[PDB]
């Protein structure tokens, strides 16, 4: 069962990477 | 597995030809100014 | 309108994509994706590999009782040697897995991908109209990766000597490398360690000085730095300071990669064994001798004869 | 009397970049550098011959140039014995004197002389952007290289012979008379795979192939030089290259770095252009020698099978143990004992000549293992043996040099293309290319 | 004996380099 | 080894190999005298 | 000879499309 | 004061020239005469293995340490 | 002049020269 | 130099013809650039520049079509005016996706002006326009020597001088023949 | 003739030492090469002839 947990954690990290790459936040002013 | 070898060779050669022809298609660098 | 070739060529070299492709990306992207997919599948589930070629396989899959910290993609078997081992040369898929072919596949595709990645860095730098030297900086990690995965196996005559694509595998590689070669007592590894530590030092100091400068500047920070450690005429220009930042770690990593590559041909580090002796030629121990004792333990312990 | 940063724009550390346009100064610099090269060659040759003893083998004294002359077949008897050492001395002295001449020439052309040669000597003066006369110079130097290769061929075929280590009963100098000029075999090496078992051009075996290849390359080089002198680049070439001094330098750097890697591998693995008698055994050679000597000593006391041979993945008999990785080894002392199915037991049992055993033991003693402070043995071994194989030094040094010159290719190629484009100095701050692009959303 | 001769020869030879520079600085050269 | 006729000139031969590395130092000192202008 | 055949096929295909 | 003034000064040069070599020779003598071997307690090459003890020494004592070091050393 | 600069420079230098002489003599110690 | 609103400052076409024949909004971006910041004002400046470039290219294409129509009606005059207008309002520092460094219509405009002056009696300006076209990267060299419109320019030796400067004979037949004879 | 070879070779070393310093001095010194044609030419000729002399003497022995 541990393999499922490890794989899910890795996939979640990759999903966060994908979200950060593509669903980026538009810049604000001043920044 | 001859089929796998042929497929891989075809893909590799296609990509390499694409690379070479793409770098040929570019035009030489030049400075518009001066 | 425009031929299909024209549109397709324009698309590749288009700069409106979210991630630039370019003419180096045509070779980088498929190679890197192949390596990624094969690596993921092999890591998650792959049969044990007979690394030493003595019918004693090592299991490194996540499905064969390994953690993340323990799982790895075992390198090819010793029996294969340096021979090219594609899928189509193996007798059968199970035979291909049992001899660690996926390691060779991943290494080859990954090396091609990183080289093309350096090329792509240069090409986008040219497209944007900036000076083309980020690729030179990137060449350092690429050089180290080439040394670990390709040059060292060549020198040692087998692909089983490359670094396993794992964590505990990395530690095992490092320990065995120290056993065979005094990596620690080699001037190039010392340069690499100095490069890494100096990179950390300079990053921290530059970040702190710049952050404390911005208040709502450069002269005040320079005065503070000069008063601190007696360097008033050191890196006054911002350009000089940033070039020094770039140069120090890159030179360090170049030299450590070269050290590893040279050790691949059995040119080891310093050897101060029994260098100090008193009258009547009796050996007086030193710290080098205790390092030698540890190296002897590591060496003798992994010599698994059959 | 050099320029200054404000006069030229290059800091002192970038001083040599001030010679890009001046021709006479550049030529003098190049000639002086060639003088340095030849000076080092001669001085090192003299040093090695001064610190040489013919009795000991040539690879137990840290010699890297005497082996090169020996391979040419000068003062060498059958089996690698030294007859007379005079040829090494004469070679060193000739190099030293020629280097003195080159040094004088370079110093003259650099200090006092026409800075630009195009004013008074249209034949020699040149401009980088020009393409016809750059190809003319390329052709001249191609002809020179072809003449050098043909000189090697003529030396091999006439006026003595090269040292062929594969001659029966221990190698000896032989006059090559039937070099292999077949195109198929010659280009098989170039199309040969670089991975294990094949090893690209490092797998050359017999000196006949070497001489045939040199014949082919000399002919091709002479023809190419003649062609380049009388021809100008076709439009496609002019449309796919940057024509400036730095671009030519970048191309040279890339080519020479690749050649450095090739030399590293060839020195490490090859044993026909680098006879083991002079450069010592290779790593695989040492491992195979150890296994073979153990087998011979074991069977001597006894007086696959014999707990020293096993079956390779393909299915033939190879030396067993940890040395199964080096089953591609092909040594002159061991080929006579190899049959169609790798090693053959009967020949091993019955016809092991004494000389092969002595050579195998000698190679077993000195394996390519060493330390940076010139201490032999494995790393954990105490300070008792002083030996670092010449092959190790050569391979390491030339790998490092090849890597640095590849870095040089990257740097100078990037700079050349940026300068040709025109935005090398920086971003113009007025109409920046990025400001004219759709925001990344 | 020979060792001392080696050192004196090395000293003379290595000083032969800066000698040219110093003479040119005094006598007058391009530099 | 080196011929007996030239034996007494062994030390100079031993010194020759290290000469070329002095040229870069010569260039550096030459710049130093010129003050890196 | 699979290499030679594949390369000849790919080059011919590209050239034929153009011609 | 400025660096150039002291660099080109005469008193500085004369005093440092007459003083520094004396101190260099003083250090040389400190090493050569054997005084360094005594003040810091470093054994000379010959007295590493005393007749009483032929192996490396060992303290195994804290409060009586001084006397045991006296005994272990050859004095 | 006996300002802080003089004191610091001499404190760092005098022992440095002493130790340099000590080590140079140490080189020649017969083993 | 073409002005913001027509005309010419040191119509542009009308003035150039005779000679040859003879902050408030974009402040936030500046302040952000003063520091090492990207921000949002830079984004609006980028969008404005991109839309302006697209509109400019559209306008240049339309007036090129207008000049072609004028040729169809046999009006060299307004067509030449349009051509040098197109040239006048070319982007200052344009890097194409294929590393072109010049807008693709620039080369054809140069060639069209060269042809216009080839028909017109005045020639040397045709040579200058052809040289500009060659430098801009008019890669195809065949109608340079085949077009009947350019025969008048071909009469002048400077035509061949420029062509040899850019299109040089690949092989020197004279040199090889002389060597063979000797 | 061995002593003859040694003395001639020592003279060759001395003249080489003179050349490796004088010639750069002649070149670098402004208008110092036009007024010393004979001196440097004679030095080079003597150097070359002495090299040949040493070579031929070695050839005898
Ligand atoms: C392309 C990249 C290299 C791939 C090949 C790797 C390799 O296994 O190459 C090995 C080959 C040599 O192959 C060997 O060739 C040998 C030939 O020897 C045989 O034949 C000989 C004939 O005398 C001897 O008899 C010898 O005993 C006998 O075994 C054997 O066949 C070996 O089994 C075989 O492995 O090297 C060569 O041909 C030349 C290859 C040159 C490139 C290698 C270095 C690349 C470094 C990249 C990173 C640089 C840093 C980048 C910075 C950014
Ligand atoms: C590649 C190196 C190189 C190049 C391009 C030149 C080019 C030039 N030199 Mg320089 N020179 C060189 C090396 C070089 N020289 C060296 C090494 C020396 C030291 C001897 C000199 C000494 C020297 C002097 C003293 C003078 C020149 C002059 C000249 C100019 C006139 C050509 C000439 O000498 O007429 C001679 C040309 C001939 C064709 C006559 C026949 C020469 C035959 C072909 C000799 C061939 C030698 C052979 C190939 C050697 C191969 C050796 C190989 C194994 C390495 C010309 C710009 C003259 C000048 O105008 O000043 C700037 C001048 O006064 N040179
Ligand atoms: C081996 C490498 C090499 C070579 C061949 C050259 C060659 C040259 N350099 Mg470069 N340079 C180098 C390394 C090199 N440099 C390095 C490492 C640096 C960094 C410090 C520089 C920095 C530099 C700058 C900043 C400039 C040059 C310039 C020059 C040119 C003129 C220099 C001059 O007038 O000297 C004059 C030298 C002296 C007056 C003192 C030395 C006198 C002699 C030559 C010393 C050697 C004597 C020799 C051993 C005896 C020969 C005997 C023989 C006759 C038998 C010359 C072509 C200049 C130039 O032309 O740029 C436009 C220039 O501005 N160089
Ligand atoms: C690539 C060419 C090459 C090769 C393969 C060799 C190989 C060899 N030489 Mg030769 N040599 C060379 C060039 C070469 N040398 C040059 C150019 C010189 C002139 C300076 C010499 C002068 C020379 C002498 C005088 C002698 C040798 C000897 C030897 C042998 C022993 C070397 C040894 O003990 O290592 C010693 C290794 C080191 C001291 C380590 C050096 C590592 C590199 C060079 C340092 C690089 C700089 C550093 C990393 C930069 C710092 C960067 C900064 C940011 C920190 C060995 C066979 C010896 C021998 O046995 O001859 C019979 C000998 O007596 N060599
Ligand atoms: C006539 C045209 C011509 C010719 C013949 C050459 C020839 C040469 N040039 Mg080039 N050069 C030319 C025009 C020419 N150049 C022009 C127009 C320029 C621009 C100014 C240059 C600029 C230039 C530079 C900048 C440099 C050269 C160099 C060289 C020499 C390199 C030798 C070498 O390393 O070969 C390697 C291979 C061999 C030596 C093998 C060949 C063996 C010999 C030569 C052939 C056998 C027959 C021979 C004639 C017998 C010799 C007898 C002798 C022992 C007495 C070579 C002699 C380089 C050099 O160092 O020159 C000294 C160099 O750095 N040249
Ligand atoms: C160092 C020596 C040298 C150098 C620098 C050059 C340089 C050049 N040659 Mg010359 N040449 C040489 C030796 C040399 N040549 C010799 C020895 C011969 C006799 C065989 C020739 C015969 C020759 C001909 C007949 C022609 C040239 C041309 C050219 C120019 C075009 C670039 C090029 O070579 O194609 C490099 C290739 C490309 C830029 C395109 C890539 C195509 C593939 C990938 C590589 C080429 C095939 C390759 C050789 C086979 C192995 C493939 C493998 C890499 C996969 C360039 C100026 C051409 C030109 O216009 O000059 C008149 C030309 O038509 N050369
Ligand atoms: C024959 C090859 C060649 C040639 C002709 C040139 C020529 C030039 N280079 Mg390039 N370069 C080369 C190879 C070459 N380079 C290589 C291989 C590299 C990678 C390391 C570089 C990296 C490089 C950079 C990064 C830069 C240049 C620059 C320059 C210009 C000025 C030279 C200079 O800095 O002054 C003389 C140089 C010095 C005084 C520096 C010497 C210090 C070195 C590091 C000491 C090393 C000593 C050590 C013993 C070496 C062995 C190390 C061992 C570990 C292997 C000049 C046009 C500069 C320029 O302005 O470009 C236009 C510049 O910024 N080059
Ligand atoms: C310009 C310059 C430079 C450089 C230069 C150079 C690099 C030069 C070189 C030069 C050279 C490179 C020279 C050479 C010379 C040589 C000689 C002069 C020789 C001699 C010889 C002899 C004398 C011999 C002897 C002998 C013999 C024969 C053998 C054995 C014995 C005896 C040893 C006795 C630099 C950059 C630094 C800077 C600036 C200036
Ligand atoms: C002598 C010898 C031999 C042989 C030899 C030979 C045969 C050689 C050949 C050689 C060759 C045959 C070579 C080739 C080479 C090639 C190359 C080197 C290529 C390159 C390429 C490039 C570099 C490209 C580039 C580019 C492109 C891709 C396009 C456009 C852009 C650019 C320009 C970037 C033998 C083995 C018998 C024996 C031993 C020795
Ligand atoms: C073969 C022969 C010969 C020749 C010789 C020669 C050719 C020589 C050369 C020589 C040379 C050519 C030398 C040079 C030297 C130099 C030097 C000795 C320098 C030094 C420098 C320094 C020590 C520096 C320092 C510094 C620092 C620390 C940092 C950086 C910069 C400076 C400057 C500041 C003889 C006569 C033996 C004999 C006869 C034969
Ligand atoms: C001591 C000795 C000897 C020796 C001998 C002899 C006789 C030597 C000689 C040597 C010599 C006698 C050397 C020479 C050298 C020279 C050279 C190294 C030159 C070079 C030149 C050049 C490189 C040029 C170039 C050019 C010209 C100028 C012309 C045209 C253009 C050109 C650029 C091509 C003997 C065996 C007796 C004995 C043992 C020891």
PDB file of N, CA, C and O and ligand atoms in Angstrom, chain B residues 19-20 23-24, chain D residues 185-187 189-190 201 204 209-217 220 236 240-241 251 266 417, ligand 9:
ATOM      1  N   UNK B  19      15.870  18.834 -37.671  1.00  0.00           N
ATOM      2  CA  UNK B  19      16.854  19.701 -37.029  1.00  0.00           C
ATOM      3  C   UNK B  19      17.782  20.340 -38.056  1.00  0.00           C
ATOM      4  O   UNK B  19      17.975  21.565 -38.069  1.00  0.00           O
ATOM      5  N   UNK B  20      18.367  19.516 -38.927  1.00  0.00           N
ATOM      6  CA  UNK B  20      19.355  20.019 -39.879  1.00  0.00           C
ATOM      7  C   UNK B  20      18.714  21.021 -40.830  1.00  0.00           C
ATOM      8  O   UNK B  20      19.257  22.105 -41.080  1.00  0.00           O
ATOM      9  N   UNK B  23      17.953  24.381 -39.095  1.00  0.00           N
ATOM     10  CA  UNK B  23      19.115  25.250 -38.952  1.00  0.00           C
ATOM     11  C   UNK B  23      19.648  25.737 -40.291  1.00  0.00           C
ATOM     12  O   UNK B  23      20.306  26.781 -40.333  1.00  0.00           O
ATOM     13  N   UNK B  24      19.387  25.015 -41.380  1.00  0.00           N
ATOM     14  CA  UNK B  24      19.731  25.554 -42.694  1.00  0.00           C
ATOM     15  C   UNK B  24      18.806  26.704 -43.076  1.00  0.00           C
ATOM     16  O   UNK B  24      19.252  27.698 -43.659  1.00  0.00           O
TER      17      UNK B  24
ATOM     18  N   UNK D 185      36.830  -0.661 -46.653  1.00  0.00           N
ATOM     19  CA  UNK D 185      37.428  -0.946 -45.353  1.00  0.00           C
ATOM     20  C   UNK D 185      37.859   0.345 -44.670  1.00  0.00           C
ATOM     21  O   UNK D 185      37.708   0.498 -43.452  1.00  0.00           O
ATOM     22  N   UNK D 186      38.402   1.292 -45.435  1.00  0.00           N
ATOM     23  CA  UNK D 186      38.871   2.544 -44.848  1.00  0.00           C
ATOM     24  C   UNK D 186      37.715   3.306 -44.216  1.00  0.00           C
ATOM     25  O   UNK D 186      37.823   3.808 -43.092  1.00  0.00           O
ATOM     26  N   UNK D 187      36.590   3.405 -44.922  1.00  0.00           N
ATOM     27  CA  UNK D 187      35.470   4.170 -44.391  1.00  0.00           C
ATOM     28  C   UNK D 187      34.594   3.360 -43.445  1.00  0.00           C
ATOM     29  O   UNK D 187      33.736   3.940 -42.766  1.00  0.00           O
ATOM     30  N   UNK D 189      35.665   2.155 -40.702  1.00  0.00           N
ATOM     31  CA  UNK D 189      36.017   2.698 -39.397  1.00  0.00           C
ATOM     32  C   UNK D 189      35.237   3.972 -39.106  1.00  0.00           C
ATOM     33  O   UNK D 189      34.705   4.143 -38.005  1.00  0.00           O
ATOM     34  N   UNK D 190      35.147   4.875 -40.082  1.00  0.00           N
ATOM     35  CA  UNK D 190      34.412   6.114 -39.858  1.00  0.00           C
ATOM     36  C   UNK D 190      32.940   5.843 -39.588  1.00  0.00           C
ATOM     37  O   UNK D 190      32.348   6.448 -38.688  1.00  0.00           O
ATOM     38  N   UNK D 201      37.214   4.708 -34.693  1.00  0.00           N
ATOM     39  CA  UNK D 201      38.520   4.523 -35.316  1.00  0.00           C
ATOM     40  C   UNK D 201      39.573   4.028 -34.340  1.00  0.00           C
ATOM     41  O   UNK D 201      40.710   3.769 -34.752  1.00  0.00           O
ATOM     42  N   UNK D 204      41.375   0.360 -35.091  1.00  0.00           N
ATOM     43  CA  UNK D 204      42.374   0.022 -36.094  1.00  0.00           C
ATOM     44  C   UNK D 204      43.330  -1.002 -35.505  1.00  0.00           C
ATOM     45  O   UNK D 204      43.755  -0.888 -34.352  1.00  0.00           O
ATOM     46  N   UNK D 209      46.389  -0.752 -42.406  1.00  0.00           N
ATOM     47  CA  UNK D 209      45.221   0.120 -42.429  1.00  0.00           C
ATOM     48  C   UNK D 209      45.600   1.554 -42.092  1.00  0.00           C
ATOM     49  O   UNK D 209      45.072   2.496 -42.689  1.00  0.00           O
ATOM     50  N   UNK D 210      46.514   1.744 -41.140  1.00  0.00           N
ATOM     51  CA  UNK D 210      46.934   3.098 -40.785  1.00  0.00           C
ATOM     52  C   UNK D 210      47.555   3.787 -41.993  1.00  0.00           C
ATOM     53  O   UNK D 210      47.221   4.932 -42.322  1.00  0.00           O
ATOM     54  N   UNK D 211      48.466   3.095 -42.678  1.00  0.00           N
ATOM     55  CA  UNK D 211      49.148   3.710 -43.810  1.00  0.00           C
ATOM     56  C   UNK D 211      48.174   3.955 -44.955  1.00  0.00           C
ATOM     57  O   UNK D 211      48.251   4.981 -45.640  1.00  0.00           O
ATOM     58  N   UNK D 212      47.248   3.024 -45.192  1.00  0.00           N
ATOM     59  CA  UNK D 212      46.254   3.250 -46.228  1.00  0.00           C
ATOM     60  C   UNK D 212      45.372   4.445 -45.927  1.00  0.00           C
ATOM     61  O   UNK D 212      45.079   5.259 -46.809  1.00  0.00           O
ATOM     62  N   UNK D 213      44.936   4.568 -44.674  1.00  0.00           N
ATOM     63  CA  UNK D 213      44.153   5.724 -44.289  1.00  0.00           C
ATOM     64  C   UNK D 213      44.916   7.017 -44.469  1.00  0.00           C
ATOM     65  O   UNK D 213      44.352   8.029 -44.885  1.00  0.00           O
ATOM     66  N   UNK D 214      46.209   7.007 -44.149  1.00  0.00           N
ATOM     67  CA  UNK D 214      46.996   8.220 -44.325  1.00  0.00           C
ATOM     68  C   UNK D 214      47.173   8.548 -45.802  1.00  0.00           C
ATOM     69  O   UNK D 214      47.167   9.721 -46.186  1.00  0.00           O
ATOM     70  N   UNK D 215      47.308   7.528 -46.650  1.00  0.00           N
ATOM     71  CA  UNK D 215      47.318   7.765 -48.091  1.00  0.00           C
ATOM     72  C   UNK D 215      46.036   8.470 -48.512  1.00  0.00           C
ATOM     73  O   UNK D 215      46.060   9.502 -49.200  1.00  0.00           O
ATOM     74  N   UNK D 216      44.895   7.920 -48.094  1.00  0.00           N
ATOM     75  CA  UNK D 216      43.617   8.496 -48.495  1.00  0.00           C
ATOM     76  C   UNK D 216      43.479   9.927 -48.001  1.00  0.00           C
ATOM     77  O   UNK D 216      43.048  10.811 -48.750  1.00  0.00           O
ATOM     78  N   UNK D 217      43.841  10.178 -46.743  1.00  0.00           N
ATOM     79  CA  UNK D 217      43.633  11.505 -46.176  1.00  0.00           C
ATOM     80  C   UNK D 217      44.581  12.511 -46.814  1.00  0.00           C
ATOM     81  O   UNK D 217      44.206  13.662 -47.047  1.00  0.00           O
ATOM     82  N   UNK D 220      43.091  13.315 -50.236  1.00  0.00           N
ATOM     83  CA  UNK D 220      41.907  14.150 -50.090  1.00  0.00           C
ATOM     84  C   UNK D 220      42.282  15.564 -49.678  1.00  0.00           C
ATOM     85  O   UNK D 220      41.687  16.532 -50.154  1.00  0.00           O
ATOM     86  N   UNK D 236      24.825  28.880 -50.683  1.00  0.00           N
ATOM     87  CA  UNK D 236      24.299  28.286 -49.460  1.00  0.00           C
ATOM     88  C   UNK D 236      25.319  28.371 -48.333  1.00  0.00           C
ATOM     89  O   UNK D 236      24.964  28.667 -47.185  1.00  0.00           O
ATOM     90  N   UNK D 240      25.005  30.340 -44.562  1.00  0.00           N
ATOM     91  CA  UNK D 240      24.928  29.500 -43.373  1.00  0.00           C
ATOM     92  C   UNK D 240      26.238  29.512 -42.596  1.00  0.00           C
ATOM     93  O   UNK D 240      26.639  28.493 -42.031  1.00  0.00           O
ATOM     94  N   UNK D 241      26.917  30.654 -42.559  1.00  0.00           N
ATOM     95  CA  UNK D 241      28.149  30.790 -41.798  1.00  0.00           C
ATOM     96  C   UNK D 241      28.353  32.254 -41.451  1.00  0.00           C
ATOM     97  O   UNK D 241      27.902  33.144 -42.175  1.00  0.00           O
ATOM     98  N   UNK D 251      35.072  27.917 -34.868  1.00  0.00           N
ATOM     99  CA  UNK D 251      35.027  26.640 -35.571  1.00  0.00           C
ATOM    100  C   UNK D 251      36.267  25.814 -35.264  1.00  0.00           C
ATOM    101  O   UNK D 251      36.179  24.603 -35.011  1.00  0.00           O
ATOM    102  N   UNK D 266      41.680   7.317 -27.899  1.00  0.00           N
ATOM    103  CA  UNK D 266      42.599   6.496 -28.675  1.00  0.00           C
ATOM    104  C   UNK D 266      43.808   6.102 -27.839  1.00  0.00           C
ATOM    105  O   UNK D 266      44.246   4.948 -27.874  1.00  0.00           O
ATOM    106  N   UNK D 417      28.563  35.273 -33.082  1.00  0.00           N
ATOM    107  CA  UNK D 417      27.233  35.452 -33.650  1.00  0.00           C
ATOM    108  C   UNK D 417      26.562  36.699 -33.091  1.00  0.00           C
ATOM    109  O   UNK D 417      25.903  37.437 -33.833  1.00  0.00           O
TER     110      UNK D 417
HETATM  111  C1  LIG L   9      43.717   8.373 -41.512  1.00  0.00           C
HETATM  112  C2  LIG L   9      43.050   7.284 -40.724  1.00  0.00           C
HETATM  113  C3  LIG L   9      41.972   6.658 -41.209  1.00  0.00           C
HETATM  114  C4  LIG L   9      40.842   7.337 -41.888  1.00  0.00           C
HETATM  115  C5  LIG L   9      40.666   8.665 -41.948  1.00  0.00           C
HETATM  116  C6  LIG L   9      39.425   9.223 -42.536  1.00  0.00           C
HETATM  117  C7  LIG L   9      38.549   8.423 -43.466  1.00  0.00           C
HETATM  118  C8  LIG L   9      39.040  10.463 -42.177  1.00  0.00           C
HETATM  119  C9  LIG L   9      37.751  11.011 -42.602  1.00  0.00           C
HETATM  120  C10 LIG L   9      37.291  12.126 -42.034  1.00  0.00           C
HETATM  121  C11 LIG L   9      35.944  12.679 -42.319  1.00  0.00           C
HETATM  122  C12 LIG L   9      35.038  12.124 -43.385  1.00  0.00           C
HETATM  123  C13 LIG L   9      35.513  13.676 -41.527  1.00  0.00           C
HETATM  124  C14 LIG L   9      34.183  14.281 -41.642  1.00  0.00           C
HETATM  125  C15 LIG L   9      33.855  15.221 -40.760  1.00  0.00           C
HETATM  126  C16 LIG L   9      32.543  15.881 -40.790  1.00  0.00           C
HETATM  127  C17 LIG L   9      32.181  16.873 -39.943  1.00  0.00           C
HETATM  128  C18 LIG L   9      33.086  17.407 -38.864  1.00  0.00           C
HETATM  129  C19 LIG L   9      30.845  17.499 -40.099  1.00  0.00           C
HETATM  130  C20 LIG L   9      30.540  18.616 -39.431  1.00  0.00           C
HETATM  131  C21 LIG L   9      29.258  19.301 -39.622  1.00  0.00           C
HETATM  132  C22 LIG L   9      28.992  20.509 -39.076  1.00  0.00           C
HETATM  133  C23 LIG L   9      29.971  21.217 -38.173  1.00  0.00           C
HETATM  134  C24 LIG L   9      27.697  21.158 -39.393  1.00  0.00           C
HETATM  135  C25 LIG L   9      27.451  22.423 -39.026  1.00  0.00           C
HETATM  136  C26 LIG L   9      26.217  23.157 -39.388  1.00  0.00           C
HETATM  137  C27 LIG L   9      25.131  22.559 -39.879  1.00  0.00           C
HETATM  138  C28 LIG L   9      24.601  21.303 -39.249  1.00  0.00           C
HETATM  139  C29 LIG L   9      24.357  23.159 -41.024  1.00  0.00           C
HETATM  140  C30 LIG L   9      24.557  24.666 -41.077  1.00  0.00           C
HETATM  141  C31 LIG L   9      24.904  25.237 -39.710  1.00  0.00           C
HETATM  142  C32 LIG L   9      26.208  24.654 -39.191  1.00  0.00           C
HETATM  143  C33 LIG L   9      27.371  25.224 -39.994  1.00  0.00           C
HETATM  144  C34 LIG L   9      26.388  25.018 -37.723  1.00  0.00           C
HETATM  145  C35 LIG L   9      41.839   5.168 -41.022  1.00  0.00           C
HETATM  146  C36 LIG L   9      40.588   4.920 -40.190  1.00  0.00           C
HETATM  147  C37 LIG L   9      41.675   4.473 -42.366  1.00  0.00           C
HETATM  148  C38 LIG L   9      43.051   4.617 -40.293  1.00  0.00           C
HETATM  149  C39 LIG L   9      43.353   5.440 -39.054  1.00  0.00           C
HETATM  150  C40 LIG L   9      43.704   6.870 -39.426  1.00  0.00           C
END
